[PDB]
Amino acid sequence: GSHSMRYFYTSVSRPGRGEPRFISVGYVDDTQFVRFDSDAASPREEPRAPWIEQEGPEYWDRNTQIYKAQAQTDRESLRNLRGYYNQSEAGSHTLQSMYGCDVGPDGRLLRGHDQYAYDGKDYIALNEDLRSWTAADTAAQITQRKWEAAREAEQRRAYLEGECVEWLRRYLENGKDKLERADPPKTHVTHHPISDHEATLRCWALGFYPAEITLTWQRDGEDQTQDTELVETRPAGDRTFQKWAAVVVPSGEEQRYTCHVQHEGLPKPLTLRWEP
């Protein structure tokens, strides 16, 4: 179906400690495949997925050069942003950056992304047309005007429509069996008394890929938003994912609840119930 490539950048100023930190990770779908950390011994882009290790030395050397320059550019961006917001030279601040492409089943660009957050809030983003920018506040409008004059959106559109899709297609061919692969979750319901009158039912989905899943509790056939606790999908640590959904029910009424599970790897949607 649909596939995506994404790069995630974090630059953190630490004026009281010395140099800022720059970290980059790259993902294809939900699979991390590269990383760079300015805080390593000698910083280098490194493989994080088995299908990328076949790239030759020119790949890692070229990309390492890019991250080192990105780290330098970001340090100056952080100094500019500190001026725009009239912020104290004393404290630590964060610039996050997130760009990449989504392609359709035929490999055609569905959407490109290129957006920034400063201190955890939206700052500026390339619009869906890849020709204009949305600025989140007056400070971001300084960047917007500067980047309009620089023709900055045309440079990024060209990467998003050209090389981004082209590298994505190549990664998808290089890592086809797994990058592609669709692994269904193994599922089960647990039951844990909270008190004499209430119990928790927990629906588990374990070991699935990709990370997209729906896990819902239905009481008498109607779903229980407002009362279902739903933890973030969490990594198993082996490139698969886990998720559970919990509902507090009156003891004696457990069997009025069903957990509905839909995942790409499941031949048919699953309806699961507590089984004593």
Partner: peptide, 9 residues
């Protein structure tokens, strides 16, 4: 492969 975003914010 990443794209360098050279021009400052």
């Amino acid at each position: 492969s990443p794209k360098l975003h050279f021009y400052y914010l």
